[PDB]
Structure 1
């Protein structure tokens, strides 16, 4: 019992400081009441009272004028229904002004925000709103500005928000605006920093192989002033690249780790190589990121940092850690010990366009872990750059670049695919700049898939595939067109795991997750390709169909009652066998008459029954829709690249390819359907609206089967 502690001990246990407790204790009425509150609280908590509940009980004890209601308010604080300062403040406002003493639980609870949840996004938006409101004055006054106004205006929008959450959001958004004061389990639980055993921001020095220089601690101090201790990550695709399923592990890891840890993630385009824009790919990268449910804190480009990358390269030369080389490209470079001043001179000369591509290079001066000598920092390239045009004719290499851009953007967790971490550190430490922690995870790849841009652009060149978005490809944009829901791909990445190696996997494991999302999300409607006309010799002359079968709590849509209904030519048989059959809603429709064409083309049917056979699917007054059915792109379900050594991955082009249906018949439930909307075609499988589908000429894609075995 906390009820048996001396008041000094009790009060420090409730979370008062020693100083506040020794004061409180002089106040007899407050001590007796605070003690009373705590006794009742521990009673109906069956527990020791945590600090947060304690501070509130303190507030209650110190402010409740009307002792009569103490057991009332304590019960709420205990059961955590009142767990916020403005909740307690509102309950106290309510207790004054309600002496009635049978108090209406519902009135009180609503008046005190009892159930109300305030989300981070909400606080984020209230704070952002206040900042915009004051931005000009914020930018000039900088840290002299009254931060009170921001919390003020934020408070006034969020009555029931925790004040510290507001304060923290204001602090952080002000930091991002001002810069430094220079004076299996859930995907998101899986990416908790504590779950993965990743370092806390600013504690890079605890990670393996990290080097603590004489500047490191100061460097991390500066790091924390710039970042405010926030987790920062990056995703760095080429702006002209094509994303595939492996990139989904990357996107979820970098944006997800940021998201799971109150952090930010940079979309940093790797545009170190000057090349013409291909706007379709760029926007597709941006879209795919958004599509899987993430938003870049900021969009940057490696080319933004060309000036600083160059400056740092000059500084490497000055420190004897880089030199200008004339090897063409391993053979020891004749130039690696040339005088520093020759390297300063020729590096400038490289920049001034005095060398042809390949005639000169800048190299770091080290031996790497794998025995590689002197990796290249800079090459001469004269293709105009899409963003800096002809401003540069020298460009940093990939590893040099994104390592030092990580330092520039103060990345806390640089997450990559395998692993030259030793050389990453070498670079930052050679220049004594902030050194982010690099962590390598294992690639993710799928069998029967080819994802090289050069190879994809030639699957499209050779018409084996309709476009780079074609559902037989395993690119991200393709899987979306094929009809996969983002949730599925993410759920897939969640289930595969967090820390592995090159793990080439079988596609059906993913399609598994596609099914499990379309089941709870894709509404059902009926259709078939091989259609037959069926004639009713019988019926009465709007049979409502549910949206989701296993839970009707979703609603229903009306479909036709007319007698001319159509069915599947795969259900209509004459002869007998072991297993077969032959309606879903109306009757049973027994075969009265049977036609036959010139040969054995059964051309129509007559039917007349109502109501125990086997129920099938049909379409009365049908809408005419195109349907595309797809096969496995590569014959070898396993990899096309030559482990099999087929001698050609273009030989493995499996001749089945596409099965186009050319406007068969479908329920009028798929009428107001927009592209990427997904349905269950009630006996065939899951299908989604291809982006070629107007309301006029509707088109569908065969997303996934209902089962495997």
Structure 2
């Protein structure tokens, strides 16, 4: 096939510049082995040879002096067992070193790092390391610093990593530090930029609605100097907000899109409005971010940008596109929108110097919107002290104004939100000739039987309907963690639906379907029961082996008490042995050799057995501990917002609520357990160490059953 080419044609098809191919075909001997090397390779390779694989054969051909060994080494570069330059340079040694004719495969493979895989984190941290080690010098010489050292020290740690991959990590991490030089399926295949038809960075000008102004090209030029063409996303919650399961699509999209595309995601707190701080929720937001597996590249506040927003707001006024208004709240046309410009500067200053009462004056943009709204407000006057900038500001930018220009300041590439007013986004940035991000709207998400407004929720916790806001029948993220859901479950959940055109409301049992698939492989098994009666064998002989989990005993086994006086549930031989029942899950069938009674069924007696009625759960020498039982909080497992028109979202409080099993009987393995540990309690359900457990007192939470009707 390929062995049929003119060499100049053959060489270029292996990935050599035409320049270096003219070079090479002057070399009769090199050129000879390169054709022979490629011939062999092709015969193994089948699908025409990749260029990258070609540069490997070219090195091989041009350095192998042994040449008894060519047919050998080529086999290792056809199957891409050798596929990096230091691997190739490794084998080039091993073969120069051993002229021994028969070469050990395993000695060879191991000393070239064949099965050896190197990870982006591993390189990231190697470079990180080198940077820190030089940070002072780096900061001062800026781009004059010899970047060679970094790749050196980086290479020093990672013997078998791609040289280009290391450069690109260096190049990136340096630009972060220096700044600019001024001279279903799986989720991160689902979130590949290519699999969404989202623009490559810098190429905003290919998206629907994007306005190309006369600066847009020089603006995108500057943009790429700042960002190295990297994807940048942001996730912008309220510092006092309360994340629910909706926000899981938000988190997974924004951090995950960045992850799947080698990018970064800023946790940008929206603190434009001045409030007193409640650290309860604030830490719980960073926590929940963490909990689902994501780490913000940087954590930032909108208040960080107040100076910048104000400067830009002043430009708006000068540019005739914004004015100071004296209309109040609650759309009537404003008497002031054509007031002279110098009149607006004067008044915006006065606003800033705190000369107007809250709402006596406002800055608005001079504009009518796609949906008819006139002159949206940019700045409001607020005198409540602000948690970060203190009392420095008494005027504040509005949410719409802000997170559009914050995106621009942070040089966001993909600005992802929930449906909208996108031509009004674009308007602002083009108004100031600043860089202009691309906005994509994805579909909202709200589950049935779920009410999540922080006000509506702090209503329940302030009646006793729920214990606190991590109460396991709330669908807040912090509650589902407490309830017992594992992170991966929620992530895999969005990996079942999670596209843009959703606006899909969803039934709760559909998620717990995922929680089972995850706990059935991760949660270990122990025996216990709630309404537990005491029973005795006839007379056995005076510690059994309960495995890790049934479907594979390849983990371990926990010892569990084997002696007289074991316990079991109700829902058993209840004297009147009606139709539909059965006889243990370990030991014997325990011949029921004697029955008892009460005034009730006070207790029972049995007999041993060995070597078939059924198998139930049991606990010999058990531990005493609480187990909380939860039921779907609302009567209507559909919206409690009056689509049903119950005329009250608080009437729908379904008096089912929580059934407390007090200290009941449980196994021995569940003793070293710390909070947020998950278990399958044989033949009951899935339970999780509640945060209030400790060695002294143990408490558990019922996550979900093992099927439905």
TM > 0.5 between the two? yes
| Aligned residue number for residue 444 of structure 2 | 443
Q: Distance in 1 between matches of 2:500 and 2:223?
A: 27
Report the 3-state secondary structure (helix = DSSP H, G, I; strand = E; otherwise coil) of the residue aligned with 2:299.
strand
TM-score w.r.t. length of structure 1: 0.99
Deviation at 1:526, TM superposition (A): 0.9
TM-score w.r.t. length of structure 2: 0.99
Report the 3-state secondary structure (helix = DSSP H, G, I; strand = E; otherwise coil) of the residue aligned with 1:661.
strand
Q: Distance in 2 between matches of 1:336 and 1:668?
A: 75
Would the aligned equivalents of 2:537 and 2:608 in 1 still touch at CA under 8 Å? no
Would the aligned equivalents of 1:527 and 1:618 in 2 still touch at CA under 8 Å? yes
Would the aligned equivalents of 2:246 and 2:445 in 1 still touch at CA under 8 Å? yes
Would the aligned equivalents of 1:449 and 1:639 in 2 still touch at CA under 8 Å? yes
Deviation at 1:574, TM superposition (A): 1.6
Alpha-carbon deviations, 1:134-165, whole Å to 9, x = none?
A: 00000000100010000000000000000000
Would the aligned equivalents of 1:172 and 1:228 in 2 still touch at CA under 8 Å? yes
Deviation at 1:78, TM superposition (A): 0.5
Deviation at 1:596, TM superposition (A): 1.3
Deviation at 1:99, TM superposition (A): 0.2
Q: Distance in 2 between matches of 1:619 and 1:669?
A: 11
Would the aligned equivalents of 2:594 and 2:605 in 1 still touch at CA under 8 Å? yes
Deviation at 1:255, TM superposition (A): 0.1
Would the aligned equivalents of 1:42 and 1:48 in 2 still touch at CA under 8 Å? yes
Report the 3-state secondary structure (helix = DSSP H, G, I; strand = E; otherwise coil) of the residue aligned with 1:671.
coil
Alpha-carbon deviations, 1:236-292, whole Å to 9, x = none?
A: 000000000000000000000000000000000000110011001000000000000
Worse overlay, 205-214 or 601-610: 601-610
Deviation at 1:497, TM superposition (A): 2.4
Would the aligned equivalents of 2:631 and 2:658 in 1 still touch at CA under 8 Å? yes
Q: Distance in 1 between matches of 2:140 and 2:561?
A: 68
Q: Distance in 2 between matches of 1:518 and 1:486?
A: 11
Would the aligned equivalents of 1:116 and 1:160 in 2 still touch at CA under 8 Å? yes
Alpha-carbon deviations, 1:351-396, whole Å to 9, x = none?
A: 1111111111110111001100011101000110000000000111
Q: Which runs of 4+ in 1 moved over 2 A?
A: none
Would the aligned equivalents of 2:538 and 2:608 in 1 still touch at CA under 8 Å? no
Would the aligned equivalents of 1:314 and 1:344 in 2 still touch at CA under 8 Å? yes
Worse overlay, 553-562 or 70-79: 553-562
Q: Distance in 1 between matches of 2:323 and 2:210?
A: 26
Would the aligned equivalents of 1:675 and 1:689 in 2 still touch at CA under 8 Å? yes
Query: Which consecutive residues of structure 2, in runs of 5 or more, have no partner in the other structure?
Result: none
Q: Distance in 1 between matches of 2:177 and 2:356?
A: 42
Deviation at 1:548, TM superposition (A): 1.0
Q: Distance in 2 between matches of 1:684 and 1:586?
A: 20
Deviation at 1:607, TM superposition (A): 1.0
Q: Distance in 2 between matches of 1:209 and 1:58?
A: 48
| Aligned residue number for residue 105 of structure 2 | 105
| Aligned residue number for residue 370 of structure 1 | 371
Alpha-carbon deviations, 1:66-119, whole Å to 9, x = none?
A: 110001110000000000010000000111110001000111111101110000
Would the aligned equivalents of 2:589 and 2:614 in 1 still touch at CA under 8 Å? no
Would the aligned equivalents of 1:428 and 1:434 in 2 still touch at CA under 8 Å? yes
Q: Distance in 1 between matches of 2:655 and 2:397?
A: 44
Report the 3-state secondary structure (helix = DSSP H, G, I; strand = E; otherwise coil) of the residue aligned with 1:662.
strand
Deviation at 1:609, TM superposition (A): 2.8
Deviation at 1:426, TM superposition (A): 0.1
Alpha-carbon deviations, 1:171-208, whole Å to 9, x = none?
A: 00000000000111101100000000000000000000
Would the aligned equivalents of 1:525 and 1:669 in 2 still touch at CA under 8 Å? yes
Q: Distance in 2 between matches of 1:548 and 1:224?
A: 53
What RMSD in Å do the two structures reach over aligned CA positions? 0.7
* Residues 1:584 and 2:598 aligned together: no
Q: Distance in 2 between matches of 1:594 and 1:182?
A: 91
Would the aligned equivalents of 1:530 and 1:570 in 2 still touch at CA under 8 Å? no
Q: Distance in 1 between matches of 2:649 and 2:699?
A: 31
Deviation at 1:582, TM superposition (A): 2.7
Would the aligned equivalents of 2:249 and 2:498 in 1 still touch at CA under 8 Å? no
Q: Distance in 2 between matches of 1:47 and 1:407?
A: 46
Worse overlay, 45-54 or 260-269: 45-54
Q: Distance in 2 between matches of 1:136 and 1:460?
A: 52
Deviation at 1:597, TM superposition (A): 1.4
Deviation at 1:47, TM superposition (A): 2.2
| Aligned residue number for residue 544 of structure 1 | 545
Would the aligned equivalents of 1:328 and 1:359 in 2 still touch at CA under 8 Å? yes
Deviation at 1:555, TM superposition (A): 1.7
Q: Distance in 2 between matches of 1:64 and 1:49?
A: 20
Q: Distance in 1 between matches of 2:502 and 2:278?
A: 32
Would the aligned equivalents of 2:461 and 2:469 in 1 still touch at CA under 8 Å? yes
Would the aligned equivalents of 1:546 and 1:552 in 2 still touch at CA under 8 Å? yes
Alpha-carbon deviations, 1:593-614, whole Å to 9, x = none?
A: 211111xx10111011312111
Q: Distance in 1 between matches of 2:472 and 2:40?
A: 64
Q: Distance in 2 between matches of 1:680 and 1:582?
A: 22
Alpha-carbon deviations, 1:588-643, whole Å to 9, x = none?
A: 11212211111xx1011101131211100000000111000001111110011100
Q: Distance in 2 between matches of 1:568 and 1:15?
A: 73
Worse overlay, 577-586 or 469-478: 577-586
Q: Distance in 1 between matches of 2:366 and 2:574?
A: 78
Q: Distance in 2 between matches of 1:146 and 1:573?
A: 84
Deviation at 1:13, TM superposition (A): 0.4
Report the 3-state secondary structure (helix = DSSP H, G, I; strand = E; otherwise coil) of the residue aligned with 1:378.
strand
Report the 3-state secondary structure (helix = DSSP H, G, I; strand = E; otherwise coil) of the residue aligned with 1:265.
strand
Deviation at 1:669, TM superposition (A): 1.2
Worse overlay, 495-504 or 235-244: 495-504
Q: Distance in 1 between matches of 2:255 and 2:573?
A: 53
Deviation at 1:542, TM superposition (A): 1.1
Q: Distance in 1 between matches of 2:684 and 2:384?
A: 52
Q: Distance in 2 between matches of 1:660 and 1:484?
A: 20
Would the aligned equivalents of 1:483 and 1:676 in 2 still touch at CA under 8 Å? yes
Q: Distance in 2 between matches of 1:93 and 1:702?
A: 61
Would the aligned equivalents of 2:675 and 2:693 in 1 still touch at CA under 8 Å? yes
Would the aligned equivalents of 2:560 and 2:669 in 1 still touch at CA under 8 Å? yes
Alignment of 1:329-348 (within 5 A): 329=329, 330-348=331-349
Report the 3-state secondary structure (helix = DSSP H, G, I; strand = E; otherwise coil) of the residue aligned with 2:205.
helix
Q: Distance in 1 between matches of 2:707 and 2:30?
A: 68
* Residues 1:608 and 2:601 aligned together: no
Would the aligned equivalents of 1:595 and 1:605 in 2 still touch at CA under 8 Å? yes
Would the aligned equivalents of 1:573 and 1:582 in 2 still touch at CA under 8 Å? no
Q: Distance in 2 between matches of 1:13 and 1:592?
A: 86
Would the aligned equivalents of 2:457 and 2:469 in 1 still touch at CA under 8 Å? yes
Would the aligned equivalents of 2:269 and 2:301 in 1 still touch at CA under 8 Å? yes
Query: Which consecutive residues of structure 1, in runs of 5 or more, have no partner in the other structure?
Result: none
Worse overlay, 267-276 or 495-504: 495-504
Deviation at 1:583, TM superposition (A): 1.1
Q: Distance in 2 between matches of 1:702 and 1:529?
A: 12
